[PDB]
Design an enzyme around this catalytic site. Structure first.
Site, PDB file in Angstrom:
ATOM      1  N   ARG A  97       0.899  -1.263  -0.047  1.00 38.35           N
ATOM      2  CA  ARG A  97       0.045   0.114   0.050  1.00 38.35           C
ATOM      3  C   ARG A  97       0.777   1.421  -0.038  1.00 38.35           C
ATOM      4  O   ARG A  97       2.025   1.201   0.483  1.00 38.35           O
ATOM      5  CB  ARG A  97      -0.759  -0.165   1.397  1.00 38.35           C
ATOM      6  CG  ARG A  97      -1.978   1.086   1.543  1.00 38.35           C
ATOM      7  CD  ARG A  97      -2.914   0.951   2.645  1.00 38.35           C
ATOM      8  NE  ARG A  97      -1.979   1.240   3.873  1.00 38.35           N
ATOM      9  CZ  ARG A  97      -2.964   1.295   5.070  1.00 38.35           C
ATOM     10  NH1 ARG A  97      -4.111   1.058   5.337  1.00 38.35           N
ATOM     11  NH2 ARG A  97      -2.125   1.410   6.181  1.00 38.35           N
TER      12      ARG A  97
ATOM     13  N   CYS B 182       0.145   5.441   0.689  1.00 43.46           N
ATOM     14  CA  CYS B 182      -1.027   6.090   1.394  1.00 43.46           C
ATOM     15  C   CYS B 182      -0.409   7.751   1.574  1.00 43.46           C
ATOM     16  O   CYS B 182       0.634   8.114   2.035  1.00 43.46           O
ATOM     17  CB  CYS B 182      -1.311   5.956   2.947  1.00 43.46           C
ATOM     18  SG  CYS B 182      -1.511   4.090   3.241  1.00 43.46           S
TER      19      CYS B 182
END
Lengths: 127, 127, 127
Positions: C104, C106
């Protein structure tokens, strides 16, 4: 596909893994400039850029690849006014690994996790 | 994998390449609205969106693909209030190439390189 | 490669498709927290994170994959001060699907389409 997990990059505490090995393609999570040995973040933007790159390198190497196998990055920064510095460090890092430069996207975001100055994600390939 | 290098998109001066050809998948760097012939950036946001798309097209075509092979883009803008205009230009560009629209992500960032209004990265596939 | 089109995620009105099925790899468009049944956006950031994740899930499942096949996401937020909440919801969502967490990235952006609080794009693989 499999998870990449290495002591050489900051541990994945939240709901994410450090990177994924998809066979030919490896994808890392967005790396922030946290030191994996101490958990600290260096103040200096050049040092932050280097710590993020080292974290990316740790994940790519944990999958059996080299910095020279990185083909695309996205560099998220807190302030494009520090980009000459970041660029110099980024350039040096690739040169140190005798690596062709990856394709890249670069943008200034509003804020990054832990108020860091940079976050870098990368894609690498085996072939 | 190999570097994509074309005179038809702005030269890659910094530590990056214009795009990478990974075999089936091509990935471009984030293209900003710099004219490859003159180095200038048009004032108009619609014109900027079109210049960025033309730059993406130049890289994809240099790899032997077409605009219709683009399957994912990320569009970073300086101001979502100009998005209707950008959308119209983007739509026209794909339509002009008889192309199915790619998957897309769209966000407003704080700032872009050279203070441009848009940056677009793309992924294309041969199959 | 082919378009992914499902009634289970908000219809792709603009010049984009919901996602693309490239064979082994599936890529979604950046999903915003629009309810596909009503077109409304929930107020609550946790609910927004969940609606975006459900939209991603609908597209991945329309391609014959599961949430557990998602290997990379990018989470764009309007305010990192709401990230603990988002993280909790994100974690729960993956856990509910007995899924290994994806890699991920972010970041906090300046603004998102329709003034939503979150946008999530995802990559999934068959193998």
């Amino acid at each position: 596909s499999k998870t990449i997990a290495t002591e050489n990059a900051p541990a994945a505490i939240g709901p994410y893994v450090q990177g994924v090995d998809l066979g030919n393609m490896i994808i890392t999570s967005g790396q922030i400039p946290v030191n994996p040995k101490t958990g600290e973040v260096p103040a200096d933007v050049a040092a932050q850029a280097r710590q993020s790159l080292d974290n990316v390198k740790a994940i790519v190497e944990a999958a059996g690849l080299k910095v020279g196998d990185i083909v695309k990055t996205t560099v998220f920064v807190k302030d494009l006014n520090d980009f000459a510095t970041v660029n110099a460090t980024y350039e040096a890092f690739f040169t140190e690994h005798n690596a062709t430069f990856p394709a890249r996207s670069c943008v200034e975001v509003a804020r990054l996790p832990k108020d860091v100055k940079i976050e870098i994600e990368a894609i690498a390939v085996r072939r």
